[PDB]
Every structure is written in C-alpha cells, then in structure tokens.
Write a protein that binds this ligand. Structure first.
Ligand SMILES: Cc1cc2nc3c(=O)[nH]c(=O)nc-3n(C[C@H](O)[C@H](O)[C@H](O)COP(=O)(O)OP(=O)(O)OC[C@H]3O[C@@H](n4cnc5c(N)ncnc54)[C@H](O)[C@@H]3O)c2cc1C
Length: 346
C-alpha cells in the first residue's frame, strides 16, 4: 500500500518513520531541506547552536528507512478521482493520503506591517538571526511559547529584548503564574510592555496605546493559521483547520489529516509533541491497531532561556502550591524546573 504524506514537519516526519517499515511511504514537502526541529530555532537564532544541529537526520537516513522524500515540491491539488496528488513536478499516486500541511504564522495587518517579521521556518530564523546580528536588539509582539522562547533565549544571549503584550496573561495561565514568568524573564533582561496594543510600526520602532518603543527589528508572534487551502480546493471540508473525526479521517475517503492543519472538535493542539503523538496514533490505526488519541489532554514543557516550565492538563481551575515550584489544580499542574515532578504529576 502506497502512503503519501504531504508535509515533512514533525507530524509528517514522525508518521513516515512509523509507517516505513510496513508501507511504501512517500513524503512531499515544498521546503528544499529535510526535517529540522522548530522548537530549537530560537536556540539557533540566539547563537547557542550551529544551524546544522537543527537537522537530526541527513537525507541518507530517509534512504536507510525506505522513505521516498520529495523536497522543493508543492502539492497543488488532490485528485480524489484518480487518486493522485498533483505537484508542479508531476503526479504522485496513493492508496492512503495523509495531510500534515501544518500552519503559517498569522500575519500582522497594521500600518507598517512591512516592518514586522514572523517566525515559522528555518529561513525565517536565518533572516531574524542576521537582522539581530545587524541591530543588536529585537522587539517581540506576542506571548505564547514562540514569543517567550525567543525573548528568553535572546536575553540569555545578551541581546536587548523588548516584549509587547496585550493584557498580562501568558500561555493562558492565571495572573499569578503569568506575573512569575514575567518576573523571571525580566531578571534575565527582557523588558516587558504589558496591557499594550500595536497602533503602528515604522522603521525605527512601534507605537502602542501607551507609547513608542524603539527597535529596528520587530518579530510578530500572535498565533497560527492552519494550511487548509490544498484540502479546500480539492473538495475536502475545512473550518479553521481540515475537519477530522476521532480516527483522523477527513470528509474524503482515504484522506486523513494530523498536526497543526487538522481540527477535531474545535481543537488544533498546536505543538510538535502533539503532532508527533497524533502521527503515532494514526500509524497504529493504519496498521489495524485501534487507538483513541486523547484530543483534550495537553502536556508540554517549554524552555524560555534557563526557565523550564511544564504545563499539564487543566490549569483553568483554582490552583494551589503543594511543593516548591509546583502549582496543582483540582486535574492540572504547572511545574518550574523539575522534570521529575512533572512526569509523576502526569
Ligand atoms: C519558533 C517556533 C518554536 C516552537 N516551539 C515549540 C516548542 O517549544 N514546543 C512545541 O511543542 N512546539 C513548538 N513549536 C510548534 C511546532 O513546531 C508545531 O506545532 C509543529 O511544527 C506542527 O507540526 P506539523 O507537522 O503539523 O506542521 P508544520 O511544522 O507546519 O509542517 C507542515 C509542512 O507542510 C508543508 N506543506 C504545507 N503545504 C504543502 C503543500 N501544499 N505542498 C507541499 N508541502 C506543503 C510545509 O512546507 C511544512 O514543511 C514551535 C514552532 C515555532 C515556529
């Protein structure tokens, strides 16, 4: 059976590894480079690792695994009729198609948006790296993991970092925890502008409700937009993401979707860890081992400079400190710099 996978992010890459010893697997990705770790891109940008350390396996490793890897190749249409994927280089037949098309950075729509950078690919990381090497500074607009990772790693490398954020909540956490994360990153050298909204950007900085912040390098990190256009124009139903059932099946026979592009009951997980877990569960399902991925539960650890933080389950309840570095909810936990305690609470 030919399994074709569009996308070689952590979703598609993990799926391919899990299926290649069993099926005839082809991966199609429009980027000209093999799989690289996105969670490590801030580390690269800040100068802590060489660009090559982002690449865990060479092209020969896809070879050794029996995975046909088609790079610098964009899928234009899915011919469900035939059943083939049409790229610009040609046509790729499938018995099973999995869409792992991921997401793009939400683009800013303000006056002066042409001065704002986003971060999604290694190529964005390269441009951001060269811009902060030219300037010695960055302004970050946002405050999910990408913005805080970036700001934390940049400050730790000794760049001037300014972070502009609406409201005062970070990572969807309560205001106490959000303030603690802020304080810890401040001590590291991050200058925060909370309760602050962008009105416009120009060459030399950004205007907010509460003033003008100087910086020629601005990076916007305000969210993602799932890539659903390939599906949409192939007659596959989409909402915010490609609409899947609890077995990752789309509205189209023989077409599945996983990762940042896939939406199940209003949820897109939005992490590499989730994307890889979905790939594993889908691999089990395709191999006739029924499995029920828990779409609700998230558990992930982020590293913002030296600060490691585990966020586990439901943190939307009322929380209580029971030990050093650990706030639990009564169903969830947040753990600062303690992987051991994070594992046992999960
Ligand atoms: C800076 C940064 C830091 C991050 N840090 C963390 C972290 O610390 N922890 C964490 O869990 N997650 C982190 N993430 C998120 C994680 O990287 C994403 O959740 C993950 O990348 C999603 O994986 P994916 O396989 O679904 O999609 P993607 O990584 O978006 O890959 C989709 C692939 O599909 C390809 N593609 C799309 N359409 C087509 C087409 N039509 N034809 C051919 N190819 C196509 C694209 O080129 C792309 O390679 C971070 C992300 C960024 C950007």
């Amino acid at each position: 059976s030919k399994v074709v996978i569009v996308g070689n992010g952590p979703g598609g890459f993990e799926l391919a590894k899990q299926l290649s010893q069993t099926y005839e697997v082809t991966v199609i990705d429009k980027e000209p480079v093999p799989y690289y770790s996105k969670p490590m891109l801030s580390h690269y940008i800040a100068g802590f690792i060489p660009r090559n350390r982002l690449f865990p396996y060479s092209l020969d490793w896809y070879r050794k695994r029996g995975i046909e890897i088609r790079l610098a190749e964009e899928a234009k249409l899915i011919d469900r009729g035939r059943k083939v994927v049409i790229t610009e280089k040609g046509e790729v037949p499938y018995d099973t198609l999995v869409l792992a098309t991921g997401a793009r950075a939400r683009e800013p729509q303000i006056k002066g948006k042409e001065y704002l950078l986003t971060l999604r690919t290694i190529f964005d990381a390269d441009r951001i790296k060269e811009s902060i090497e030219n300037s010695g500074e960055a302004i970050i607009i946002g405050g999910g993991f990408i913005g805080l990772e970036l700001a934390g790693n940049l400050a730790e490398a000794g760049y001037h970092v300014k972070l502009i954020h609406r409201g005062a909540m970070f990572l969807g956490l309560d205001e106490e925890l959000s303030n603690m994360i802020k304080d810890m990153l401040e001590e590291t050298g991050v200058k925060f502008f909370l309760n602050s909204e962008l009105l416009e950007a120009n060459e030399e900085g950004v205007l907010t409700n509460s003033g003008f912040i100087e910086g020629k390098v601005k990076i916007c990190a305000i969210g993602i937009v799932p890539n659903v256009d390939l599906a949409r124009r192939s007659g596959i139903h989409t909402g915010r993401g490609i609409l899947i059932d609890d077995n990752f099946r789309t509205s189209a026979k023989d077409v599945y979707a996983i990762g940042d592009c896939a939406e199940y009951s209003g949820i897109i997980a939005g992490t590499a860890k989730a994307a890889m877990e979905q790939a594993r569960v889908l691999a089990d399902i395709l191999k006739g081992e029924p499995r029920r991925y828990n779409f609700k539960f998230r558990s992930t650890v982020f590293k913002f400079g030296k600060l490691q933080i585990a966020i586990i389950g439901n943190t939307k309840g009322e929380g209580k400190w029971i030990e050093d570095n650990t706030k639990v909810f009564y169903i969830g936990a947040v753990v600062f710099n303690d992987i051991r305690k994070a594992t046992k609470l999960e």
